Ligand binder design. Structure first.
Ligand SMILES: COC[C@H]1N(S(C)(=O)=O)[C@H]2CC[C@]1(O)CC2
Length: 281
């Protein structure tokens, strides 16, 4: 049982050690498309690239490239798109991806500014009466409503395909209280947030995959998907304690590199699953 493994690693202070074995066992697949010179300004970080095998392709004939990966968890029957925080020049590609994949939710785990630097472009409207038009991808985005809570904000957005005049409602879930350094002290508000996403229908098989991002789309984004998938597998299985968080993480790392950036994010992921298991047993 993971709770006792938690006890052992914590008492022995073997978090980094565990983290390094995960790093060494992690898959390495080609990322040739990401490294083409015509795509250099589509990548926020030169060392964070989607693998070619799992990369999301845009349906535009010119350049299909976005820094986004499909993570397919076959036993849990859950998919996620993990992406970077859009850049000033990829906001239109971001919303084209949302459209093309039939996503119902966008999960944002960062602030636009952290540590005095921009981590993401402002890619959604701040006021109902000031909608955004992405001329490169022929999309219009309107803020419908905004519900601001202590730990997170939920926004209803209308995305319109200006080409076909079809519209969809997109939910934006914005976790606003992840600290600039380290991880939250308690997983309580992160679990609350994860249950609110689930309750919305955004993670359900009747929609395209949820879009999940932070700045790079590997650290906090990784923690979100890892906790969700582990708790779902504990619901599904005859024996809940058969769920090994290290194996799930390695299965998720076949689809996108570097998921869970620090030993502190790993320890936080265990804490989130262990605490969330109580509210599921
Ligand atoms: C308490 O988290 C594990 C800590 N260790 S340890 C000795 O348990 O691996 C190192 C110092 C800070 C850390 O948070 C991460 C590295």
């Amino acid at each position: 049982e993971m709770e006792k493994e938690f006890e052992q690693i914590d008492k022995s202070g073997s978090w980094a050690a565990i983290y390094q074995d995960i790093r060494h066992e992690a898959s390495d697949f080609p990322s040739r498309v990401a490294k083409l010179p015509k795509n250099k300004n589509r990548n926020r970080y030169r060392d964070v690239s989607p693998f070619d095998h799992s990369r999301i392709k845009l349906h535009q004939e010119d350049n299909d490239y976005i820094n986004a990966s499909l993570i397919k968890m076959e036993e849990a029957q859950r998919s996620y798109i993990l992406t970077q925080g859009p850049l000033p020049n990829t906001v239109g590609h971001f919303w084209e991806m949302v459209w093309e994949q039939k996503s119902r939710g966008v999960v944002m785990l960062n602030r636009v500014m952290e540590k005095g630097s921009l981590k993401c472009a402002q890619y959604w409207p701040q006021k109902e009466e000031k909608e955004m038009i992405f001329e490169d991808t022929n999309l219009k985005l309107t803020l419908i409503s905004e519900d601001i809570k202590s730990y997170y904000t939920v926004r209803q957005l209308e995305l319109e395909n200006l080409t076909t005049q079809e519209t969809r409602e997109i939910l934006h879930f914005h976790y606003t209280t992840w600290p600039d350094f380290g991880v939250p002290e308690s997983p309580a508000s992160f679990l609350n947030f994860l249950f609110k996403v689930r309750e919305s229908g955004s993670l359900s098989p009747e929609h395209g995959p949820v879009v999940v991002h932070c700045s790079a789309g590997i650290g906090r984004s990784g923690t979100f998907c890892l906790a969700d998938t582990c708790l779902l597998l504990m619901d599904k299985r005859k024996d809940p304690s058969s769920v090994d968080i290290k194996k799930v993480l390695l299965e998720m790392r076949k689809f996108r590199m570097g998921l869970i950036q620090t030993a502190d994010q790993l320890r936080f992921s265990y804490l989130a699953v262990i605490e969330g298991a109580k509210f599921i047993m």
